[PDB]
């Protein structure tokens, strides 16, 4: 049951986290009515959010020789650094980035 | 003092370490001669050496969010694997290998 499009498939997986700003009334009329209210205050809500994960990993024991292919950045020179800002502000990730470098054998 | 060719400098290095075969003479003459013995049997000798060193490592705790240069091999297809034997069973470095891939700030 690994998923399709990558990564770890589980029968509990981390849970779903829902929020909602609590609806306010804007004010009632003066005299009783039954239907439920449709005018409110505009709100919205703002903060900061935190997550902490904790990874196992499994360290390489290889004996092989020769240097393995590592990932690296390029030393020759661009109007940008990759994995950065720009001039404008913008933050851009310039290639996709697997996880597969080192080797192993069968 | 560090030395101008590379390395650790130090006042009391690995010592030098020094072996030779003891000389074995041949049969030496039945009357007394007071020279010293110019005729020695043909001998070389032959054994394992092993040697093994403790290195301390000083560990990288950069906060750089771009990723750092790295070395390694390229996938590209050639006739030999570099650092390796050839068809013929000679061994070869391609290339020479320095230490300086990580970052620091000054």
Same mark, same amino acid.
């Given at each position: ?18 929020? *909602? ?8 009329? $003066?005299?009783?009515?039954?239907? *439920? ?21 499994? *360290?390489?024991?290889? *004996? ?7 990932? $690296? ?13 720009? $001039? ?14 080192? $080797?192993?054998?069968?």
């Amino acid at each position: 049951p690994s998923p399709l499009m990558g990564g770890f498939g589980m029968k509990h997986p981390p849970p779903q986290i829902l929020i *909602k700003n609590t609806p306010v009334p804007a004010d009632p009329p $003066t005299a009783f009515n039954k239907d *439920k209210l449709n005018s409110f205050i505009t709100q919205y809500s703002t903060g900061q959010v935190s997550v902490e994960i904790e990874w196992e990993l499994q *360290k390489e024991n290889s *004996k092989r020789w020769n240097p393995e292919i590592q990932y $690296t950045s390029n030393y020759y020179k661009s109007n940008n650094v990759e994995f950065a800002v720009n $001039t404008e502000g913008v933050y851009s990730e310039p290639r996709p980035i697997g996880t597969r470098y080192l $080797t192993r054998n069968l």
